[PDB]
Amino acid sequence: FIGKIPIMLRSTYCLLNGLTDRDLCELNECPLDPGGYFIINGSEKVLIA
Amino acid sequence: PYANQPTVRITELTDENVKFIIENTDLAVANSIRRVFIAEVPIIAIDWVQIDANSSVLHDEFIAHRLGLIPLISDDIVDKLQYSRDCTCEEFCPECSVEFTLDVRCNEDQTRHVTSRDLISNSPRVIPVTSREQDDILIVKLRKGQELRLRAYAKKGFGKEHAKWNPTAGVAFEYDPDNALRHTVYPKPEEWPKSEYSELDEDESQAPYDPNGKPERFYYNVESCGSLRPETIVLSALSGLKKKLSDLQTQLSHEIQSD
Amino acid sequence: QPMIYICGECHTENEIKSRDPIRCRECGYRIMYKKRTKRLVVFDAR
Amino acid sequence: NELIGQTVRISQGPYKGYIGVVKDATESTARVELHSTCQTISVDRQRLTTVG
Amino acid sequence: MIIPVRCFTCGKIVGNKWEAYLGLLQAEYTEGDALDALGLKRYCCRRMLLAHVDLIEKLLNYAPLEK
Amino acid sequence: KRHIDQLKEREYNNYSWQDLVASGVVEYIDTLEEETVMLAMTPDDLQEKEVAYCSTYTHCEIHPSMILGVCASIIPFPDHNQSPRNTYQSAMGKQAMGVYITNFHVRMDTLAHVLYYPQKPLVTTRSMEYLRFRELPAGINSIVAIASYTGYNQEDSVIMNRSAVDRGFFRSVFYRSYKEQESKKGFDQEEVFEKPTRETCQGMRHAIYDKLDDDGLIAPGVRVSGDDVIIGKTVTLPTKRDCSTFLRTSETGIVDQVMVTLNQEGYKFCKIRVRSVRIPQIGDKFASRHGQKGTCGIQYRQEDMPFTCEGITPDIIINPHAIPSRMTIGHLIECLQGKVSANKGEIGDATPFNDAVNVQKISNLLSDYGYHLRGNEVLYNGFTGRKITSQIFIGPTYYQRLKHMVDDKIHSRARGPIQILNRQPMEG
Amino acid sequence: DGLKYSLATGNWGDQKKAHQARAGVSQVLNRLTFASTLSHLRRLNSPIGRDGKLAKPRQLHNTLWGMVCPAETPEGHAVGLVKNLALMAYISVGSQPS
Amino acid sequence: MGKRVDFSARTVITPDPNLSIDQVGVPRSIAANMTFAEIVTPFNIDRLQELVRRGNSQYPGAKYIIRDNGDRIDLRFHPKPSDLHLQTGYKVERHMCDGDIVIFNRQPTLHKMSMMGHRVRILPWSTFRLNLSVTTPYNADFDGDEMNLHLPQSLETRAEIQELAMVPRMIVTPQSNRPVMGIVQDTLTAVRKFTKRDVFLERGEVMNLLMFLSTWDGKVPQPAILKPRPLWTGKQIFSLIIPGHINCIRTHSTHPDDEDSGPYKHISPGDTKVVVENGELIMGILCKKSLGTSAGSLVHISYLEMGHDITRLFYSNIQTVINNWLLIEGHTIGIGDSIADSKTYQDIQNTIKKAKQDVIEVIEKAHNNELEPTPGNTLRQTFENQVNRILNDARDKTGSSAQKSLSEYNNFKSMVVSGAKGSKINISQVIAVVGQQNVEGKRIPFGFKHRTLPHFIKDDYGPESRGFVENSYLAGLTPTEFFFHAMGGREGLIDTAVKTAETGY
Amino acid sequence: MNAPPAFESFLLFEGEKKITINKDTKVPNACLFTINKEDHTLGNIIKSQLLKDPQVLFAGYKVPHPLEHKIIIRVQTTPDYSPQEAFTNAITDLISELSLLEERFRVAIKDKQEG
RNA sequence: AACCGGAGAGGGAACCCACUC
Ligand SMILES: [Mg+2]
Ligand SMILES: [Zn+2]
Ligand SMILES: [Zn+2]
Ligand SMILES: [Zn+2]
Known part of the structure; x- marks a missing residue:
């Protein structure tokens, strides 16, 4: 165990990857949400290019 | 120095709207009648809402707002009611309000449409506008497991307070369809389409100017929201304006005789 | 006294005590929404 | 004061039918925060009725 | 969200026309035909049905907090 | 044609954009390679036998309107406006209140604004479909009259219909959430949620604590106001001193929901969301999709507003003097096209650089529905009833309500709190 | 804890040298409207000092054609420095030249 | 040098044309917060003793x-009845009330007309409301x-603000000996249309307009036309607005220069020489040049000849009575006002084509070394100068053609002629030609490399290829x-931000 | 929080008077009438009826501020005729005019239904 | 048969976003 890396939503390693719209609605997630942001201490962060 | 004699003739009478014409009266009187139609005809709408449970997806004020806009058939009760501010009764009584109840729970797996039919009134006469194939006003949609219960009270008010007490849907008002007084000036009269009430051949664009004319033949089309009959809206408006002027007359007479 | 809460996952109404570690007795979950108040609420329809 | 913090109903005047919470009360009048609107007004004790 | 009860400008009751409007759009009435099939002549009332978006259906897709 | 035919049936043949790239039809070009390429703005209009300009075109553009961004792709007719107005609209589109996400009820977030009745624009560009704007829209198709009515709209202000607002026009709701985390931070010192008692607690505000439950939290559905206890938290005094959280002064809302859990440290944790309905009032900042911002100046009832022959009274009146300095012609064209679309039943198309639509065509279409071909109408004075001598430009336009309300800016002071270093009044 | 700090405060670098590290990266996602959320996820920042009197970097260059939106920039002190991305623009991810 | 201060408020501003130039409307919430300390005296002991009782x-x-x-006894936390009694030496901090003097400013204060005094009036909703003529000094926008x-918290400083910094006392600036306030926005446009020769008012419309004059003696003037029916005139009523016996001569914006030389000098066919004599408007059309902030305008002379109080009433009366007439007249702008006669479109197209052909043949001369450099200039400089000359001439000619095509009823012309908003180049840009886009003057x-966009041939100096x-x-x-x-547009937007850091320093 | 109540536009408080009469000192036989809690609906019809009187030298109305709810009516009459009786005569003629209109309207509506 | 009020704590540093010009 080296550590834990914060992971980006809807990325290939997020739990929401590949889910269908019905599944997302089951998880109280918006299908229209594009993801691409991190969750840290329960707050969204966006890496500005 | 005296009142002129006006005349009325109705060109269309329906359960939905009245269209009529007034002759031999001032522009100000016509405009004031048009004004009282919208603002100062008393009507009944639900104003007090107490929510006992609400598991829907719309918040309590959103449902209470939508409830306020539901028209209620108040044709003869509204005359015999009293304003809640004027009733000597300490709490709600049948002579100053009308009570409504709504208890709907969705249990089956189909989406439940809570509509105006679900509002259970206390009086057999004061009910929603869907009294007598068409659907009914949709309040909210409930998923399985959600419910809402609420108790409401309807009072008498006019448009001046809130738009929910507005009896009329659309008050079309016109006078002088062909520009004879020329209160409006068309830079290019050709481009302007003829009015419904205009009386001109296809060639002529506007009537010739006459300097001696005055506005007469006011055309009205009063379309009801469904709470009051279109024909009784006008009678109530005329009675209300006359009563308003009478109260001012009494207060001025009292003031002068005391002065 | 009883103060029933609603579980966040299975939405079961259940009772949990003062400083008791927040659990749902049926499931491995720890987010608990409160219950709507019992006192009168009155709104204007404006 | 006893009345402060007690839910009250307005039973007289134009505000009739409104519920509220007495924020500050005196022996002559009381400040009532209304439930329906986002405003706190002042109403005499005679129009108030304790509920609950 | 949900269909408004009354037209903002006119005040005509438009809250009961949404389900009928959708039903007529299923039957290859066009919007220009379905709207005046329901008795909406003023463009102020017509824009309500024409431009309304119904998000209440997406909200109902989510499971209720209670049961 | 075969590529378009395959793509048009894409749901059944899974023929996607990647296959189009693999076919050798399209290419990815960056700036370095764009220096040495010969582009064509439109294939039909620039690759033909004519007076030869270039005979060696190398690439062609899919559509010029793709040079815009996300916020700049919601402006109808952006090529009929002065470029600074487009920039102002791009900035102001980020502040228009709408439904920001579908699951906004399960989301405990500070500073959420949602509109009651959002509408998709009557006049739309073709690129709004890919932004899902029609699924999460941010404004209302109102009826605007560009007239100088009573002088309350003069410098960049707007007059509004009070009756329209009474019917839910631009009404919204505002959610604010508060978080509290009781923390065991000392040798004796433990924070704990409870109802503070007047005999036990050391020093507390004048606010009534009766709204709290025995848990130290309010039940959802309880009216709250400024200087009210939201969470009753006390710390033991080595009797006890409270650190209760009060409602933000003048926030003046209704408790929406209360969530209790454990943080990652195992301590109790509470989040409280509070509603407040915001009805538009004078001073609230509104805007159009062309950079025509402005506050509400006054609100007249339906009876007071000018009306057409038909009882149509504009929802918003804006002053004509805003146009000739700003040169937002796109605003006028949108209004005309919006009237056509509301009457026709179609949804107007306002893509930039679309050569198939212009003012003349829209005017001819509008002439068929019994209106003046240039959008002018004859309005009647609301007070006197006499018809206005001039004709008034009127029609449906898409307005946005910005988040800059007036109740969030007004404040005064008269000997309140003082700083600690130099004894001057605080800031903020 | 180091990654969490750098993505929570925005200071890109070691905590011990927080003044030396450039700030402003990893801002709080804007969640006012869907357009605001979409725009915030597609934003380029020039790491040049603000409040500078050199206006050449702030000007709209010809090479922004079809890759950076010309209309969309903040109108405050960061005019022409913070810029949004075109609709069909794609940023290369890189690959081995072997 | 600067510090936070007490007894100050701040909120959004909105217009109100029903206030005087020296009044400001404030919300009750702000008024009920801010207090003023009144010293008790046997004159006001009763008033203050009721005020303290109210709490x-x-x-x-x-x-x-x-x-x-x-x-310091606090009344808002259960005051005892014993200490509500007050003596003649005490002070009472009462709520701000109607008529109190306040100082008002917009934060970019660049000159002394940014911090000026006002009289408080209490109004129902949450915004500061100030009259529209006071907008110009503050540089306010209501957007x-x-x-x-x-x-002001003490009696001495209150009197000093009243006697030094009141708005009506600040009408003329010592910066350029011109008035600072003027008629602006839709009154200016409505005044130009209201004072034209062919404006006639029936009896009822006159009686309504006179209802909005504060400085009226209750004497209805003899109508300019008696018998066919009584008709008044716009000038005949604007004369009642003008105070005292003022005498000045101004020329309208559209006054032709040759009119003065020839006949009809004192009987203007175009109604374009303003002549006010003995406090009465005889002839002419009032525009920005007559009621604006220019030196020698009708408000400037009114302030110089009469007191500031009379000039204050003059501002208020103009706005009220003209705004109430615009209810009848009405004024708008639409898509029909930006359209031309199809003749003018063909003329504009021909002008553009001729100019474009002229640039092409200049380029051909330059390519064949047939262009002789201007003395004192280089081959590139003179080529650039010639191209710019041709394009500027084309834009000016097209603009003039569009201006001539405009009709009398056009609303763009109505706003430009009166000077209320817009300029003569905005109309040309909207209707005829946007023009040439320039970056750093060039x-x-x-x-x-060697071209502006990838859509153009290398070394393309034509008008289309360089920004026209x-x-x-x-x-x-x-x-x-x-x-x-x-x-x-990006260039101007950048300069706006860059300029301030230098100007403020 | 500063929004006035909706019923503020038509309800009189305790102590307020509906109509107040003030004599005008500038010119003879002039008077000013202040009506509380009224709007154009009443001022306009009163003014138009007054303008029909041959013995009325001046009649006008105004609302001092839209946010306030008050009307001011100025009436000047020739010297043989008080403004107060001119005002009451206009009211009592307008009332009669409206009553006649209502009666004719109801008769016409009855005749429209199978007539 | 017999008194029975009552407060005082939130500060600074840094960063970002936005607004009016
Ligand atoms: Mg501004
Ligand atoms: Zn009763
Ligand atoms: Zn569970
Ligand atoms: Zn409508």
């Missing part, structure tokens, strides 16, 4: 009572601007012209 609950009440000791208000530079926009804002811009126009 902090009711708006017209008191918050604190300061005693001779400096002891979301915030302004802040300071309340044309659009070659930002890709031959379309109007009514006809829309081509995509290349759209991008070039964005490049032009």
